[PDB]
Design an enzyme around this catalytic site. Sequence first.
Site, mmCIF file in Angstrom:
data_model
loop_
_atom_site.group_PDB
_atom_site.id
_atom_site.type_symbol
_atom_site.label_atom_id
_atom_site.label_comp_id
_atom_site.label_asym_id
_atom_site.label_seq_id
_atom_site.Cartn_x
_atom_site.Cartn_y
_atom_site.Cartn_z
ATOM 1 N N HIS A 1 0.856 -1.176 0.000
ATOM 2 C CA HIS A 1 0.000 0.000 0.000
ATOM 3 C C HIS A 1 0.893 1.226 0.000
ATOM 4 O O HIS A 1 2.043 1.165 0.486
ATOM 5 C CB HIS A 1 -0.919 -0.013 1.231
ATOM 6 C CG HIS A 1 -1.992 1.038 1.221
ATOM 7 N ND1 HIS A 1 -2.686 1.393 0.087
ATOM 8 C CD2 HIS A 1 -2.554 1.746 2.231
ATOM 9 C CE1 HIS A 1 -3.579 2.318 0.384
ATOM 10 N NE2 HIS A 1 -3.525 2.547 1.680
ATOM 11 N N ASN B 1 -4.346 8.299 4.731
ATOM 12 C CA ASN B 1 -4.756 7.194 3.867
ATOM 13 C C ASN B 1 -5.716 7.732 2.768
ATOM 14 O O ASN B 1 -6.073 8.917 2.766
ATOM 15 C CB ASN B 1 -5.360 6.062 4.727
ATOM 16 C CG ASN B 1 -5.268 4.700 4.078
ATOM 17 O OD1 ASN B 1 -5.070 4.598 2.869
ATOM 18 N ND2 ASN B 1 -5.462 3.623 4.884
HETATM 19 C C1 HKH Z 1 -2.589 0.097 -3.955
HETATM 20 O O1 HKH Z 1 -3.854 0.653 -4.324
HETATM 21 C C2 HKH Z 1 -2.861 -0.711 -2.718
HETATM 22 O O2 HKH Z 1 -3.308 -1.994 -3.193
HETATM 23 C C3 HKH Z 1 -2.904 -2.206 -4.556
HETATM 24 C C4 HKH Z 1 -2.175 -0.941 -4.981
HETATM 25 N N1 HKH Z 1 -0.748 -1.300 -4.868
HETATM 26 C C5 HKH Z 1 0.212 -0.534 -5.419
HETATM 27 O O3 HKH Z 1 -0.056 0.356 -6.202
HETATM 28 C C6 HKH Z 1 1.671 -0.783 -5.138
HETATM 29 C C7 HKH Z 1 2.250 0.411 -4.373
HETATM 30 C C8 HKH Z 1 3.665 0.147 -3.882
HETATM 31 C C9 HKH Z 1 3.694 -0.705 -2.632
HETATM 32 C C10 HKH Z 1 4.336 1.473 -3.549
HETATM 33 N N2 HKH Z 1 2.379 -0.965 -6.385
HETATM 34 C C11 HKH Z 1 2.226 -2.044 -7.171
HETATM 35 O O4 HKH Z 1 1.487 -2.980 -6.847
HETATM 36 C C12 HKH Z 1 2.936 -2.041 -8.504
HETATM 37 C C13 HKH Z 1 2.372 -2.692 -9.594
HETATM 38 C C14 HKH Z 1 3.001 -2.676 -10.836
HETATM 39 C C15 HKH Z 1 4.221 -2.010 -11.004
HETATM 40 C C16 HKH Z 1 4.958 -1.950 -12.294
HETATM 41 C C17 HKH Z 1 6.291 -1.750 -12.656
HETATM 42 C C18 HKH Z 1 6.503 -1.775 -14.048
HETATM 43 C C19 HKH Z 1 5.343 -1.974 -14.782
HETATM 44 S S1 HKH Z 1 4.002 -2.143 -13.708
HETATM 45 C C20 HKH Z 1 4.787 -1.370 -9.910
HETATM 46 C C21 HKH Z 1 4.152 -1.382 -8.674
HETATM 47 C C22 HKH Z 1 -0.607 -2.609 -4.216
HETATM 48 C C23 HKH Z 1 -1.877 -3.303 -4.659
HETATM 49 F F1 HKH Z 1 -1.680 -3.696 -5.964
#
Ligand code: HKH
Length: 216
Positions: free
Chosen positions: A163, A183
């Site tokens: 998250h 949040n």
């Molecule tokens: C968020 O809404 C909480 O639940 C969902 C969303 N989430 C994220 O956005 C993650 C945030 C990180 C912990 C900072 N990031 C990712 O899941 C994510 C997905 C895909 C990428 C890519 C890199 C290159 C192409 S796509 C990066 C990061 C966690 C969960 F999915």
Amino acid sequence: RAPDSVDYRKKGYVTPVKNQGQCGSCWAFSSVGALEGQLKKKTGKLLNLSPQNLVDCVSENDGCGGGYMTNAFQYVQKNRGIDSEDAYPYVGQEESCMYNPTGKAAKCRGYREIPEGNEKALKRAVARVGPVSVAIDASLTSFQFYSKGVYYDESCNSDNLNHAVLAVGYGIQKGNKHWIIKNSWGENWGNKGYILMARNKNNACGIANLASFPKM
Ligand SMILES: *[C@]1(O)CO[C@H]2[C@@H]1N(C(=O)[C@H](CC(C)C)NC(=O)c1ccc(-c3cccs3)cc1)C[C@@H]2F
């Protein structure tokens, strides 16, 4: 040193709490919050920037499948702008990019990353710049049912970053040092949309593991 406590809500740097819905757009809400704080500092005006703009247009992230905040900052930089929420409103699903430079509300001059796991550095960045985009483990039901106090759970896994939220300040409550966390699960979540998370308790929930802020 930096002040013992800081709260950028008292400085008018933080917009109301938003509700992302179930689109995995936490990274975009996290990114706009950081940008909002820097725009206030720059221009004196507080306004809502467009998470949808980031969802639809940051081709390096995966929209409602998730993303990194650093990618989002880089997009705002290369694009030479981000739209306002008013000009590019949130609909909570992926669409084709409809960025319009006429609705531009902010620019970005790159970004900086806080040294991994370093809560003192994170503290000093918050103090010096404003709100900082952070990633945490929010997977425990104890996190998700938070109501009050300074949140701490020994089962939090600092390697499980699932998250993205916003550190808007830090301080202390009944002797327990904390980070003040905005949040994006609406005002009915937590305490009016916020949670106080344990600070200097061995990088609890990976709070200092993937922290970054935009330059402006
Ligand atoms: C968020 O809404 C909480 O639940 C969902 C969303 N989430 C994220 O956005 C993650 C945030 C990180 C912990 C900072 N990031 C990712 O899941 C994510 C997905 C895909 C990428 C890519 C890199 C290159 C192409 S796509 C990066 C990061 C966690 C969960 F999915």
